[PDB]
Write a protein that binds this ligand. Sequence first.
Ligand SMILES: O=C(O)CCc1cccc(-c2cnc3[nH]ccc3c2)c1
Length: 193
Amino acid sequence: QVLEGLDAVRKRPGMYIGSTDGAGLHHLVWEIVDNAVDEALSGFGDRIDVTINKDGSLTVQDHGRGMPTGMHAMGIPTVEVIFTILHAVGSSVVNALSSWLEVEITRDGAVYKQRFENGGKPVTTLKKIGTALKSKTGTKVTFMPDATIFSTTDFKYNTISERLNESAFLLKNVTLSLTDKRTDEAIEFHYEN
Ligand SMILES: O=C(O)CCc1cccc(-c2cnc3[nH]ccc3c2)c1
């Protein structure tokens, strides 16, 4: 396995997300949502909340275990390695094709955050920003797709709604929600079994 930096994704985005049109834009959403879904499939977290923010960014929040908060080699946070090294893998690809991205992790009574800008360059380390109840766990990822890469940066409520509905049906017993702050639209899906 040859590891690569995020420049490899930015120079050949179609290789990783298929295209740079609306289909490619939404593949970014699928990658972030699918990580939360995978956690829930393993029994960690029973709701996944997606928000299309007023500024055009998108947030996915889950209540899974929380991504690793520890260190890799050289005092580099494990989360930074996940978001900045291409193991060519979804997280790093989204970061590469975003003008900014924030990851917030809650676990063990602490809330941590790291911010990346301009195609995934870290502008902070993983820093403790606050506290929470010891029971509270989860990951929140917010990203702004890079307008210099995509021909459209407009997330489509109906497209995302449909995908989240399908994911809720396949998962069972997990609530998926979508809120659009541009229009105030909102919906929730949950299938009991
Ligand atoms: O605490 C441990 O030992 C396991 C940690 C642990 C191990 C593997 C995966 C996760 C994890 C969790 N939430 C996530 N949300 C999106 C991706 C993602 C990954 C957390």
